[PDB]
Structures are given as structure tokens and as C-alpha cells.
Amino acid sequence: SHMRGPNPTAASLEASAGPFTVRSFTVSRPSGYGAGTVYYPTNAGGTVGAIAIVPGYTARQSSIKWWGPRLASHGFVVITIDTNSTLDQPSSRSSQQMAALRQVASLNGTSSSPIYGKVDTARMGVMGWSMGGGGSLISAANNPSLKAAAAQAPWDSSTNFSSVTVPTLIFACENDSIAPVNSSALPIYDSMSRNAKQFLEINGGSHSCANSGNSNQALIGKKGVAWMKRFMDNDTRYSTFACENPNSTRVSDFRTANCSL
């Protein structure tokens, strides 16, 4: 267990920001990816786990930026990345996500870095949108020591993620016409037998339903923070929120397995 911050409430996890103070910086010399913003917290008590977030095809940090402060304010170091090319495919995106986690761990050891010793480099998570969500699931399949994964509107050329043992949360957008739920998100979710997993489908959601500026930041933010706290911190105070079937008009579908209360 790695418990930091007060006992959460649905209300405080729905809030725009958690208890901790967040400052950010642009990574100076990115190592094995295009660009990175690091978001961190100053007064967490101990060190916090790190999460690397990757956008979709043609997209940049903009699409996924809101997660940086939303997660960091609850006790994580979060790096949002631009890929080497906006036209990088999921396997390449996974490689770059893992290179960003690698560099976050190096900046942890770098006296000139604002996250100097602010990071616990044994507790790492992966997140991403679309092809970046596909990348996150590849990162989880290839690296089972990752503590948690969350993909929003994921897309990959293959829907078989049966090797994934990492607790995985899938955000789906009901009306997605880019990576439709019935051919992408759902099939990907159904492939995972060996892990804690969850599927939350956003009612009437387009492909961008979990991106910066979305109309469900309360519910989506609550779920992603609760999932990452539960599984990255092994913090059982978050079990109620991580596993709950939300009683919301904003949710069109909910599935979960191996998520014990």
C-alpha cells in the first residue's frame, strides 16, 4: 500500500482538482519521443507513481492534456507526449510511451529537474486515446509490471489483448464512428480474461468523448483517478469508486471483472 491524501468521496473525485498542488514543465531533451510536458505534485508526502499518456493519429498533447493536472493533483507524476511523427502507428506509440516512462525516471534522478526525487520509479501506469490507447494496451501486454492502464476510445489493428494481466480501464464513446465500440473498444475489452478490467461507455459520446474539454470530466476524471489510485497505489479506499457501476444517465454501458470490492 501507498496511501497518500485523505479518504476520497465521489464529490471530491468529481471535482476539477484533487488535494495536491500541481506545477508543470516542457521536457528539454526528449529521449525516444517527440516532446513531453511533466505535471507533478509538490506536497504528496511520499513519492508518487508515474503515468505516461499518448494521443491518437494526427493529435498532440492538447487532446489529452486535462489528465495531467487532474491525475497529478491526486498524487502522480504524469508525462503527456507528442510522438516523433503525428502519423506514428500504435506499436511505435507504445515504444515512445515506454521511453517517456524511462525519461521520467531519469528526471527523478536529475538535481536540475523540478521532479527531482518526486517520483517512485517502481509504480508506473499507461494511458492514451485511440491509437495511443492501442499503444497503452501494447505497453501493458509487453510490460506486465505496469500497475495500471486506461485507454480511451482505443484502436489497434488487432483486438486480441488476452496476454494483458495489468488492471485495465477502457473508456468507450457510444456513438464513435472512427473506432466504433462494437468493432474496437468492446472486442478489445472482451479479449482480456486474466486481469482486473472495466468498460465505461459514455452515453451519446463521439470519438473525442474523454478528450480535453469533454462534457463528462466529473465522471471520467473520477473513474480514471480512482482506477489509478486503486491499482498503482494498491489503495483499497478507492475500491468502492474503481469497481462501482455508476448510477449515471451519462453512462450507456458498464462492465467489470476481477475488480473486488
Looking at the chain, list the stretches that DSSP marks H as alpha helix, in order from N- to C-terminal side.
10-14, 67-72, 90-108, 131-142, 185-190, 217-232, 239-243
Domain boundaries, the chain: 1-261
Q: Report CA Rg, the chain.
A: 16
Buried-exposed string 30-48: b where 16+ CB fall within 10 A, e elsewhere: beebbebbbbbbeebeebb
Question: Other CB atoms closer than 10 Å to residue 60's CB: what's the count?
Answer: 16
Angle at CA 37, nearest 5°, toward 15 and 11? Answer: 5
Q: Which is nearest to 178 in space by CA: 202, 203, 207?
A: 207
Cross-sheet strand order for the sheet of 22-26: 22-26, 35-41, 76-82, 48-54, 119-129, 148-152, 168-173, 197-202, 251-257
40 is in an annotated binding site: no
Q: Alpha-carbon distance 139 to 96, whole Å?
A: 10
Residue in the block written with cell 493536472: 69
3-class secondary structure, 49: strand
Task: Say if residue 89 is exposed, middle or buried (CB neighbours under 10 Å; 0-12, 13-18, 19+).
Answer: middle
Residue in the block written with cell 486515446: 129
Beta carbons within 8 Å of 33's beta carbon, 6+ residues apart: 81, 82, 83, 84, 96, 97, 99, 100, 103
| Cell numbers placing 141 | 501486454
129 is in an annotated binding site: no
Q: Which is nearest to 70 in space by CA: 14, 113, 144?
A: 14
The residue type of 231 is: F
- H or E segment to which residue 257 belongs: strand 251-257
Beta carbons within 8 Å of 181's beta carbon, 6+ residues apart: 172, 173, 174, 201
Beta carbons within 8 Å of 190's beta carbon, 6+ residues apart: none
Q: Which is nearest to 129 in space by CA: 77, 58, 199, 48?
A: 58
Handedness of CA 203, 154, 82, 218 (dihedral sign): positive
Task: Say if residue 155 is exposed, middle or buried (CB neighbours under 10 Å; 0-12, 13-18, 19+).
Answer: buried
Which experimental method was this entry solved with?
Answer: X-ray
Q: Which is nearest to 202 in space by CA: 244, 162, 170, 228?
A: 170
- The catalytic residues are 130, 176, 207
* Cβ atoms of residues 152 and 129 within 8 Å: yes
* Cβ atoms of residues 210 and 218 within 8 Å: no
Q: Alpha-carbon distance 25 to 114, whole Å?
A: 8
Q: Alpha-carbon distance 186 to 101, whole Å?
A: 27
| Cell numbers placing 256 | 467489470
228 is in an annotated binding site: no
Provide the CATH topology of domain 1-261: Rossmann fold (3.40.50)
Residue in the block written with cell 448510477: 247
